[PDB]
Each structure stands twice: as structure tokens, then as C-alpha cells.
Design a protein around this ligand. Structure first.
Ligand SMILES: CCCCC/C=C\C/C=C\CCCCCCCC(=O)O[C@H](COC(=O)CCCCCCCCCCCCCCC)COP(=O)([O-])OCC[N+](C)(C)C
Length: 203
């Protein structure tokens, strides 16, 4: 992760560049919308998120976003999660709860946050990249996602909450049934965002 990337993540934050290709809404909640672009060759998706979360100190959100011990503690979909220093960087292992029959999914990745000063504005930006480790090979039963990358941009909304932009993409190593998307969309996330807000006020 370079200087470059971090600032890049801040862009669509200011301005939602969706014109480009065939993006599509999918959800709107707590003041948040989720777009997605489908690579027709692979059938994979690209998600993009914008929105505002009043009641979430831009500063809190960011801290809460890196606090595993706590995140592990309140995020109903976290099966396993822990960090380790490998060389000079922080590598994260994360296991995600998938409805049985489906195998959970686990990620090994390089995470990095940087608080930016752009125009006298604190713009909390975090980056995520999939990486690998001899000592941390794949697991049986759990699907190791080897392609994954996300970036989240936090910022004050001026009032009580925080305006945010997020880019996501990973290859789940399996087909995601559309009902799952429907649940994710129609119930999954809404609740998550709900549980997370509760998670802020209680920090
Ligand atoms: C500044 C705002 C902070 C974020 C809040 C706003 C939006 C986050 C929620 C949704 C973003 C959509 C793209 C991420 C999906 C990956 C799952 C995840 O991992 O979902 C969580 C939030 O759990 C949830 O929704 C609960 C849903 C879990 C069900 C699992 C199967 C989902 C199948 C596809 C979902 C279909 C799209 C949803 C329709 C809206 C965001 O993971 P994370 O970014 O906290 O770190 C993530 C680090 N891994 C990648 C290593 C985990």
C-alpha cells in the first residue's frame, strides 16, 4: 500500500463515479446504498457503498473498524478473527459465517489505515489486500478466499454522523445463491448496520 492508493479511495467518497459501467442499486438503509457491477465473464461482482451514518463519530467508526477484540465480540458473523505482525505489516485472518450447508469463508489479508489531512479534513481511510503465509495455509471445511480487496473511506458529515464510501471485491471460491443475496440485501445488512450503530454508542 502506497500514498497513491489511500488518496484514491477518498475520491468516490467526495464523488460517486458510477457512470462508468452498468452499476446497479441493490439496497438503501440507515442512509446507505449498495451498488454492484457484474463482470459477465466471471459472474463475479464488484460492490460500491456510499451513505451516511449519523450517530457514528467518524473517529469512532474507524477505531471500531480496526478493533478485532471488540469486533469479534459483537459481530454475529465473525467465526474466527485475529491479527499478527508479519515483517512490518499487520496481517489479518478472518473467518466468515456462511449458512449451512455452505462452507464458511476465511481471509488472510494486509489491512492498513491512514488518517488524512486533505483540506484540513480528517478522512479516515483503510485498505485491504489478500496475501499469503507458509505457516497459515488453507483449512479443510472452510473456503480460503485468495482474491480480495476493499477500501473504506470515512469522513464527518458535519453533524453527528459520518459520510462514507467503500469499494469491495473478492472471489468467494463458490457460487453465491441469489437468495443469499436477497437475504443479505433485504435483511442481512440492514441488521448489521443496525447492530453496528448500537456497537458505536456502546463503545
Ligand atoms: C464505514 C462503513 C462500514 C461498513 C458498513 C457498510 C456496509 C457493509 C455491508 C455490506 C457491503 C457489501 C459488500 C461486502 C460483502 C461481504 C460480506 C462481509 O464481509 O460483510 C461485512 C458486514 O457484515 C454483513 O453485512 C452481514 C452479511 C454476511 C453474510 C455472508 C454471505 C454474504 C454474500 C454476499 C453479500 C451480498 C451483498 C449484500 C447486499 C447489500 C463487511 O465486512 P467489513 O468491511 O467490516 O470487513 C470485512 C472483512 N472480510 C471481508 C474479511 C470479512
Amino acid at each position: 500500500f502506497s500514498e497513491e492508493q489511500f488518496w484514491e479511495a477518498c475520491a468516490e467518497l467526495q464523488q460517486p463515479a458510477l457512470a462508468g459501467a452498468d452499476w446497479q442499486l441493490l439496497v438503501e438503509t440507515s442512509g446507505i446504498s449498495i451498488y454492484r457491477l457484474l463482470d459477465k465473464k466471471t459472474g463475479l461482482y464488484e460492490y460500491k457503498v456510499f451513505g451516511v451514518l449519523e450517530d457514528c463519530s467518524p473517529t469512532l467508526l474507524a477505531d471500531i473498524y480496526m478493533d478485532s477484540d471488540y469486533r469479534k465480540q459483537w459481530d454475529q458473523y465473525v467465526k474466527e478473527l485475529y491479527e499478527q505482525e508479519c515483517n512490518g505489516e499487520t496481517v489479518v485472518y478472518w473467518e466468515v459465517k456462511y449458512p449451512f450447508p455452505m462452507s464458511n469463508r476465511d481471509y488472510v489479508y494486509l489491512r492498513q489505515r491512514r488518517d488524512l489531512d486533505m483540506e484540513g479534513r480528517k478522512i479516515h481511510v483503510i485498505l485491504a489486500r489478500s496475501t499469503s503465509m507458509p505457516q497459515l495455509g488453507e483449512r479443510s471445511g472452510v473456503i480460503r478466499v485468495k482474491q480480495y480487496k476493499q477500501s473504506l473511506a470515512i469522513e464527518s458529515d458535519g453533524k453527528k454522523g459520518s459520510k462514507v464510501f467503500m469499494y469491495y471485491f473478492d472471489n468467494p471460491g463458490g457460487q453465491i445463491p441469489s437468495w443469499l443475496i436477497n437475504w443479505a440485501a433485504k435483511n442481512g445488512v440492514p441488521n448489521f448496520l443496525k447492530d453496528m450503530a448500537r456497537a458505536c454508542q456502546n463503545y
